Every structure is written in structure tokens, then in C-alpha cells.
Amino acid sequence: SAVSESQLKKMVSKYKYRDLTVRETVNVITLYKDLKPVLDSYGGSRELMNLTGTIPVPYRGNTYNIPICLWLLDTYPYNPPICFVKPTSSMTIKTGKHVDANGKIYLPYLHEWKHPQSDLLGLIQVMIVVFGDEPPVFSRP
């Protein structure tokens, strides 16, 4: 149950920067075992690859597996990913500074994104720190 680089290259066939996107995706899924690459229709408009799953976020002495979806545009890594928190039936989205009504994530890291200094490993690192202070979702009481 693991994705081969070959399968990843096929998923980004229509991408403008393929090797770069594959390279970073491999890095991300290797370090974050709970994120999985999936080719899906973005908003039912067009196919793009995204990293789906959870990232470990420590909050008040406990670690939570926050559900997220990182959409890699066909311009990745030159343009930042479009990121969303994805609440399950047992939780709700906490709208605030870094999360809007739709669960879309907003971070300075994304706003000033610039290749090659900016990357997914850096972005996820930021999310763990930022969400650790302000969770993007909470379990339903």
C-alpha cells in the first residue's frame, strides 16, 4: 500500500513542472506517512493532484491528526497549493484568522510563496506550528 513514482508522474502528466512536483510530493509523503496523493476533480471543474490525509498537530499536551487537503495546481511549485481543512462527521471547522467559512487555509507562508525557498515541507511545518496554537477544527461536543 504505497504509491510508486511512476504512478505519481502519470498523475501530473498535464503539469507544467512535472519533475519538481513529483520530487516534492515524494518528500512530503515520505515524511508525512498519513498524506496520500490522489488525482481528483477540483470543484468538479478539472483534474488536479492533491495530497489528502492528516498531519500530526500537538495541542495542549495531545497530538491530533488534523484532516487536510493540499491541491497542487498545474503551476506548482511556482504557485502555492490551495489548502483546505477537511472536517469529518465528528468535528466542525473553526473559522478564524487562518481558516475561512469554506475551510480554506490562509497563511503568510502561502501569501508570499516563492520558489524555490518556499516548499510543501516548509508549509506543513508552518501548519503544525500555527494549528498547534489555533486548531482549524474541533470535535463536536
Partner 1 sequence: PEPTAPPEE
User: In the set 13, 30, 65, 75, which binds partner 1 (CB under 8 A)?
Assistant: 65
Contact string (CB under 8 A) for partner 1, positions 9-28, x = contact: --------------------
- Separation between Cα atoms, residue 122 and residue 141, nearest integer Å: 33
Sheet holding 82-85, edge to edge: 35-42, 46-59, 62-72, 82-85
Please give the torsion angle defined by the CA atoms of residues 11, 12, 18 and 22, in that order, rounded to the nearest 10 degrees. Answer: -40
Report if residue 135 touches partner 1, rule: CB under 8 A.
Answer: yes
Closest approach, Cβ 85 to partner 1, in A, equals: 9
Helix (H, G, I), strand (E, B) or coil at 119: coil
Closest approach, Cβ 93 to partner 1, in A, equals: 10
User: In the set 88, 106, 108, 129, which binds partner 1 (CB under 8 A)?
Assistant: 88
In the chain, where do the E strands start and end? 35-42, 46-59, 62-72, 82-85, 91-93, 137-139
Q: Which region holds residue 8: left if phi is over 0, alpha if psi is between -120 and 50, else beta?
A: alpha
Q: How many residues bind partner 1 (CB under 8 A)?
A: 23
User: In the set 41, 45, 62, 102, which binds partner 1 (CB under 8 A)?
Assistant: 62
For the CA atoms of the chain, what is the radius of gyration?
Answer: 15
Candidates 4-12, 20-28, 63-71, 111-119; binding stretch for partner 1 (CB under 8 A)? 63-71
- Separation between Cα atoms, residue 115 and residue 73, nearest integer Å: 14
Candidates 17-25, 38-46, 59-67, 95-103; binding stretch for partner 1 (CB under 8 A)? 59-67
Applying CB under 8 A, the residues found at the interface with partner 1 are 33-34, 53-54, 56, 59-60, 62, 64-67, 87-88, 90-92, 135, 137-141
